[PDB]
Write a protein that binds this DNA or RNA. Structure first.
Ligand SMILES: [Mg+2]
Ligand SMILES: [Mg+2]
Ligand SMILES: [Mg+2]
Ligand SMILES: [Mg+2]
Ligand SMILES: [Mg+2]
Ligand SMILES: [Mg+2]
Ligand SMILES: [Mg+2]
Ligand SMILES: [Mg+2]
Ligand SMILES: [Mg+2]
Ligand SMILES: [Mg+2]
Ligand SMILES: [Mg+2]
Ligand SMILES: [Mg+2]
Ligand SMILES: [Mg+2]
Ligand SMILES: [Mg+2]
Ligand SMILES: [Mg+2]
Ligand SMILES: [Mg+2]
Ligand SMILES: [Mg+2]
Ligand SMILES: [Mg+2]
Ligand SMILES: [Mg+2]
Ligand SMILES: [Mg+2]
Ligand SMILES: [Mg+2]
Ligand SMILES: [Mg+2]
Ligand SMILES: [Mg+2]
Ligand SMILES: [Mg+2]
Lengths: 181, 130, 49, 258
RNA sequence: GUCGACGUACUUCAUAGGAUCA
RNA sequence: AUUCAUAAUAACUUUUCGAAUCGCAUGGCCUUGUGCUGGCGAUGGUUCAUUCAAAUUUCUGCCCUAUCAACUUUCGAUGGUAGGAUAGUGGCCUACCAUGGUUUCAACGGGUAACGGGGAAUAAGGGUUCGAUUCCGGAGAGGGAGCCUGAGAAACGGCUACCACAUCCAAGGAAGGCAGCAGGCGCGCAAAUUACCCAAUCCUAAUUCAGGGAGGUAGUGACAAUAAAUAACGAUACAGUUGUAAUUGGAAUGAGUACAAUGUAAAUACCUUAACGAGGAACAAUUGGAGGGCAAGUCUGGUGCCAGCAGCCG
RNA sequence: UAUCUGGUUGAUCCUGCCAGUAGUCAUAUGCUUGUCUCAAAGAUUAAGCCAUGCAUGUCUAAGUAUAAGCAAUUUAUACAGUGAAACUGCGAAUGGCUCAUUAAAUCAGUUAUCGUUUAUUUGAUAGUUUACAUGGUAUAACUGUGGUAAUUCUAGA
């Protein structure tokens, strides 16, 4: 038979889901960023936990260790590239200082809201899922799309979208035809 | 308009052709037919349309561009010699051979396996018996 | 019930269904077994021929 | 099993072939030939996954049946012929010649050579013995039996073989200071110079090799292949000249060139 | 035979103590 | 490291091998003859080496059991000599010999819902458990036994017998092995298609071409996993700057339908895309839990008008 | 276990105790089930029994065609293209499936063959024994005559 294809879980249930403070924190996060469910928050928390555990394990290694140098430099480069970590904080200690909000801000939903293309996080989500947002020349319909620093300046309305210079949607030309008739 | 660009061009004299990756920009169009791409590539490479093969075209998410693979044979005879039969059938260069389904052929094979010899002697034997 | 057999018949040719599916249906009936029902096993009945 | 096997699973194939794990369920089993199964590169992998001339096995067969491929100066038509180390592959239509030499990573590299360098190869003398009628002969690492050898040729030496006639033109003794190429183990693909051969009777002899950067490593004698005197190899060497570079140095160079 | 011994599985009884107030 | 490679002498052999084979082409010598010579290949053939393998083999490592302490040795158990047999070492077997071999550092016997490993889970670490199941190796083809062929089989989609089942029959005979792919029974209670194809992966052959239920393609119970729609922006209205709308405005879009093209061996689907596709956006999201309130209603109890049960029923 | 909730009296604090609340994985099962990518399908310790179909055949210029086969023809009065059947060669000992037996057995790592077989591939290797080329000591396919209810049964010439 053919060789297996790998798969993995991108989220995990927290140790105590029922903590009242935790429930309030999830409520605030979902409301601020317009997240659909607690699964997305768990996903970002799982990613952050993985990153911080890797950073801690590297820190346990003695300085100048080739493994520490190579892996820590790669990790810091990735975090700086995605935008979570600022340029001036290029150390493993500041990697442990990251928070879920830093990742959530980089989502294409929040970026579309912030850049002024949308009036709310929910309006940004609707614009994304309806194929109105293009990062460069590529239409992206995934709200969880993580925007890189270089990609940040190229978010715009898609060429095919009615807002981006294409013809009006079905409703607009429908109403125009009915008015004309 | 439509723009066709050939990338990663390799010249394969072993198979007597040129291989490449065809990237098609087709703004305001669903996609480009293999016929039109073959004609345009033949015009570009100064070959007969019969000698141009194109396949594996996928339109990128969001539309506007397609990527596929293309072959340009040195002349038509080499194309007929090397090209797969199914692709030739697609282009009309060869006619589809009509054959029974695999189950029919396999059952016929087994029935013939049961018979020994030409079988004419068996036929006349059963005829005389009955 | 969950998982019940459901047979699919495509078209009628010469007032007959496709041969393959009827063969499948015919075999399915053949190997079938019937439960004992309370009423039918307590009363005598007969379908007039 | 009740006899020899004829199939090879992709996951069971040699790693250095670099085969996709999802492309299929089977991999080309190298037919019997000069080189062992795990130390060989079948022509299908070379023509398809390395040179990219052929897009599928059928096209490889079409190429071979046209008799366009020569291995060591002789035309081969078998898809899974086990081409291996130091084998010269000639494609006359493309006017191209290749020598199969490991790169530092441990994988057969696409190394192009000149026609003059394609006229000969090198062979490690695996055995030296008298045949029938008292005619001495040498058996090399590719299974070539060459009769009437120079008496000075002993085991572990490297003989330069002319492909046109298959005769020994020159030979190199195994001694300290000789340039060697590692053909097995985790140091596969490295080039260095012998420093000392540690001899153990009834066991495996170990050789200490010093590379150009002064690093030293120990390898079993079976994996060593003499290729010339220091700085003067008898064959053109691949890019990097068999020098291992740490991951950090590779990163630095890659960023520099990019 | 509402029999004895053992093995196994269960049920049940033993929880309030100090300080202030009325 | 050898009685090794190799060589020599004397013979021996139901005794072998040393081309009575095939395709394409028609070159060179001459004393001019269908004379002499001669090219590129295929297939066989002895031996050696190599490759694919096989067989045997050295060291170390297995779960529970001591309320299993002695076991093996008559019928090989330990070893020696010679033979036989094997491809070959060898108690592998035979004949004659000795009396040896294992064991509280657990032999031997018993249990195993015991194929072994790479691996999986958990855990802070030590540990504990799982591993029929994508790779490797072993064993089997209903249960024992024995073989022909062949380089390779103790083969079972090869053969013969016996044991158990079981099909056809004119009763004389004949034919069997799904722990292969589909699909049935094993209950009276249940679960993938008796689908398409060699296009890719590789395998077999005299062989580029034929074959391949190996394998791929699609179909089919939410196996295990990834992403992610079910609305967004306003105005008006009503009620205690908050809440509620079968109120209302024109913009957005895919679920679905479908010219087409791409995809594919041919198809389906995906990615594209003309034209349709939204207010109850009825294009009608689910699974659990908690708490109410209502009567000319019903039942039970009693320090009056109350309390409990409860209330789809007035 | 932790956290949280509740009970421990005439009430409120401070202790202690008691009850419920944790977990993924596994089995069975219930309700719901729109889109994209991807992927698996065991289990009565029953390795229990199987209707039906298929799953192993194979020809190049290069072993054997007077098929009373096809089509081309005077490129062919030995043959010459293609070619059923049969002989010959190879494969069928690979692949696929299941985990019954098996407790120093298998298997893992590591050794040995100076202890042996090896089709095939690859390289070498054979002036030493009517020939302008020997037989049936011979048959298949095929022609023709037949037996059997029946089989991938086969008898005589
Ligand atoms: Mg659009
Ligand atoms: Mg040795
Ligand atoms: Mg002996
Ligand atoms: Mg004896
Ligand atoms: Mg186990
Ligand atoms: Mg068992
Ligand atoms: Mg296992
Ligand atoms: Mg077996
Ligand atoms: Mg069975
Ligand atoms: Mg058997
Ligand atoms: Mg079978
Ligand atoms: Mg078998
Ligand atoms: Mg089955
Ligand atoms: Mg032949
Ligand atoms: Mg259900
Ligand atoms: Mg819905
Ligand atoms: Mg869609
Ligand atoms: Mg003829
Ligand atoms: Mg035969
Ligand atoms: Mg035991
Ligand atoms: Mg052992
Ligand atoms: Mg063969
Ligand atoms: Mg040979
Ligand atoms: Mg006869």
């Amino acid at each position: 038979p053919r060789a297996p294809r790998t798969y993995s879980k991108t989220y995990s249930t927290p140790k105590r889901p029922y903590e009242s403070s935790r429930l309030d924190a999830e409520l605030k996060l979902a409301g601020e960023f317009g997240l659909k469910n607690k699964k997305e928050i768990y996903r970002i928390s799982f990613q952050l936990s993985k990153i911080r555990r890797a950073a801690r394990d590297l820190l346990t290694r003695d300085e100048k260790d080739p493994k520490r140098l190579f892996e820590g430099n790669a990790l810091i480069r990735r975090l700086v590239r995605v935008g979570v970590l600022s340029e001036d904080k290029k150390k493993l200690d500041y990697v442990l200082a990251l928070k879920v909000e830093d990742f959530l801000e980089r989502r294409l939903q929040t970026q579309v809201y912030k850049l002024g293309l949308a009036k709310s996080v929910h309006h940004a989500r609707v614009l994304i899922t309806q194929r109105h947002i293009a990062v460069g020349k590529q239409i992206v319909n995934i709200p969880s799309f993580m925007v890189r620093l270089d990609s940040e300046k190229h978010i715009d309305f898609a060429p095919t979208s009615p807002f981006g210079g294409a013809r009006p949607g079905r409703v607009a030309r429908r109403n125009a035809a009915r008015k004309a008739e | 308009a439509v723009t066709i660009r050939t990338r990663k061009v390799i010249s394969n004299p072993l198979l007597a052709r040129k291989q490449f990756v065809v990237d098609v920009l087709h703004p305001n169009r669903a996609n480009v037919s293999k016929d039109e791409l073959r004609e345009k590539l033949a015009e570009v490479y100064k070959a007969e349309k019969d000698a141009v093969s194109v396949f594996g075209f996928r339109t990128q998410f969001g539309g506007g561009k397609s990527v596929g693979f293309g072959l340009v044979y040195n002349s038509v005879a080499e194309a007929k010699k090397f090209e797969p039969t199914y692709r030739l059938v697609r282009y009309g260069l060869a006619e589809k051979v009509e054959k029974a389904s695999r189950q029919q052929r396999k059952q016929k094979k087994n029935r013939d396996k049961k018979i020994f010899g030409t079988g004419k002697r068996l036929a006349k034997k059963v005829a005389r018996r009955n | 019930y969950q998982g019940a057999k459901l047979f699919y018949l495509s078209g009628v040719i010469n007032g007959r269904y496709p041969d393959r599916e009827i063969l499948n249906l015919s075999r399915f009936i053949s190997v079938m077994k019937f439960r004992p029902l309370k009423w039918r096993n307590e009363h005598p009945y007969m379908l007039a021929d | 099993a009740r006899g020899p096997k004829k199939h090879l699973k992709r996951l069971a194939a040699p790693h250095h072939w670099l085969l996709d794990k999802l492309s299929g369920c089977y991999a080309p089993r190298p037919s019997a030939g000069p080189h062992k199964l795990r130390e060989s590169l079948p022509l299908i992998v070379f023509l398809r996954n390395r040179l990219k001339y052929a897009l599928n096995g059928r096209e490889v067969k079409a190429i071979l049946m046209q008799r366009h491929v020569k291995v060591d100066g002789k035309v081969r038509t078998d898809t899974t012929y086990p081409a291996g180390f130091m084998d010269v592959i000639t494609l006359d239509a493309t006017n191209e010649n290749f020598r199969l030499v490991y790169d530092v990573k441990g994988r057969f590299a696409v190394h192009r050579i000149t026609d003059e360098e394609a006229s000969y190869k090198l062979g490690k003398v695996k055995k030296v013995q008298l045949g029938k009628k008292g005619v001495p002969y040498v058996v090399t690492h590719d299974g070539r039996t060459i009769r009437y050898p120079d008496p000075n040729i002993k085991v572990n030496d490297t003989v330069k073989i002319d492909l046109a006639s298959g005769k020994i033109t020159d030979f190199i003794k195994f001694d300290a200071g000789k340039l060697v190429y590692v053909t097995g183990g985790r140091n596969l693909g490295r080039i260095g110079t012998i420093v000392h051969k540690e001899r153990h009777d009834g066991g495996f002899d170990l050789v200490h090799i010093k590379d150009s950067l002064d690093n030293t490593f120990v390898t079993r004698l079976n994996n060593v292949f003499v290729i010339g005197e220091q700085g003067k190899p008898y064959i053109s060497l691949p890019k990097g000249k068999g020098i291992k570079l740490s991951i950090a140095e590779e990163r630095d160079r890659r960023r520099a060139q990019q």
